[PDB]
Design a protein around this nucleic acid. Structure first.
Ligand SMILES: [Cl-]
Ligand SMILES: [Cl-]
Lengths: 289, 289
DNA sequence: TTGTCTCCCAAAGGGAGACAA
DNA sequence: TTGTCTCCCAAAGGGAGACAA
């Protein structure tokens, strides 16, 4: 069940492609992630790759999640999320659990008692256990978390604006995680050169290479199912078409995102204007007509 | 004076070479730092480089120090350090200042008063100010730090085994720093490939490239003055010679550290046995006969 | 010399409804 | 519905010598 926790801490719509399936590796997207004179490398804009391995992991102190993926080029369970408020982080009080959250995720309280209460034990990404006291009190009544909250906010160093996740599997085990609100080993040019050179060798030799996916630090996925890439490139978009991605927008143009470095590429090849003002260049597979 | 603080947080004997001087870039050492199938790159084992720029910096949250250096290949003020003990970090009590520390570093207390005391204001690497109360009390008497200590240990998240630094310049300004007791963006092969490829292009084209120095994460310096490299290579070592580095040892052999990848290199080319048991391969410039 | 303990008084917070958004 | 406030009783800690390493 921890694997389902990892995707929760990552994001609701991450959906990593399944190991052993063909995927489209898009180097320009890999470059955008590790960006959150130089040797130029002649390299294809999409590299169809076999997904050889996925390793999910998390940094214990930072609690951030990342995955190691191994590529070789070729020839639903109940949960809830809440963004933390001031009273949740502040020393006084506890944690206000949303009403919909307690009925669908947390185990159902025995309302015969007064106040209804249970000792909740939850596991985080690294196997630790956290004992929260889940109570039903106040006027008007509300679901709170008291005993373990003060300890939990202090060791995981949460502040307001972050968010906590709770995830119950069909198993008895309850799982908890946190998602924090949004250059120390190599310089940017060296990181740049590294990505493209590993990819260039891997593409020419048809040999294994590896990369790290940071779903939180990733503006858009750069390892997507190869069939999803092919369907969007086959489908013809035209200016003025109506698409969704739920936000709605209109396609204002279709050209290359970078004709100098990455010519002929479908990466962010669509120019769109957003209907509601609340990035104007997106890729074909992200939008749906 | 903050530049002298950076070298304190780095280490006592770091002594970065001065900008504008010729240096010897040793790729194998750069590789050892970022290590704390693959394309092989034909590259020299020492690259004489002009040191174009040094940028000293520090991560605010982690408090770790690193420097960005720009290379182009070609054709004392009073301070004290104390490792933190349990009573220094524990909630009760304060901070015990060593006796030698208060007389040579901290401003001299006015012992006419009772208890002698002063409000100390210190700056860390990032311009912040910390107010400590420096008192002389106890029986037998001792120099302590009280008021600001509890706050300082909690925000900088110090534990036992770390160390605090205090540094007074000739200016009135007092400076404080901490040194903490001893793969999230790129995989190791990609980092490897990046270092060597940036160096290979920079060496062939005689163009600028950059690197990051992590003095705490660095087992031995890999950017050294070019004259220091040349003197040690000119000097002939022989087996059984007596050297110092203060520890004392004997030279047991002289061969290549890696004949396959880095042949003919002077990097860690000396085999030594240590006189006191309390790495047995070192480079010529680190040892002194 | 200095780390660690004990213990005292004040502070800081765990947890409880009271109130509007 | 739920964030925030107030305020009460217990806890946790700031700071002070007392003692050996
Ligand atoms: Cl895992
Ligand atoms: Cl600086």
């Amino acid at each position: 069940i921890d694997a389902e926790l990892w995707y929760a801490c990552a994001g609701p719509q991450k959906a990593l492609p399944p190991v052993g399936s063909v995927v489209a590796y898009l180097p320009q997207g890999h470059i955008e992630q590790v960006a959150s004179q130089i040797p130029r490398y002649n390299l294809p804009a999409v590299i169809p790759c076999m997904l050889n391995d996925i390793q999910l992991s998390a940094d214990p102190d930072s609690d951030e999640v990342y995955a190691t993926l191994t590529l070789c080029p070729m020839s639903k369970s109940r949960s809830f999320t809440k963004t933390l408020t001031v009273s949740d982080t502040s020393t006084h009080g506890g944690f206000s659990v949303p009403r919909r959250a307690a009925d669908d995720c947390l185990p159902k309280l025995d309302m015969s008692l007064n106040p209804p209460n249970q000792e909740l034990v939850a596991k985080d990404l690294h196997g630790n256990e956290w004992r929260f006291r889940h109570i039903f009190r106040g006027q008007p009544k509300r679901h709170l978390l008291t005993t373990g909250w003060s300890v939990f906010v202090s060791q995981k160093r949460l502040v307001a604006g972050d968010a906590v996740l709770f995830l119950r599997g069909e198993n008895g085990q309850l799982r908890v995680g946190v998602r924090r609100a949004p250059p120390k080993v190599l310089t940017s040019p060296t990181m740049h050169i590294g990505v493209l050179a590993a990819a260039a060798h891997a593409a020419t030799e048809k040999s294994r290479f590896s990369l790290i996916y940071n779903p939180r630090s990733c503006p858009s996925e750069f390892v997507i199912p190869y069939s999803k890439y092919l369907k969007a490139v086959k489908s013809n978009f035209n200016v003025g078409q109506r698409f969704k991605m739920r936000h709605t927008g209109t396609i204002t143009g279709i050209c290359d995102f970078d004709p100098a470095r990455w010519p002929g590429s479908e990466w962010r090849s669509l120019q769109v204007n957003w209907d509601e003002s609340s990035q104007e260049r997106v890729s074909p597979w992200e939008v749906e007509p």
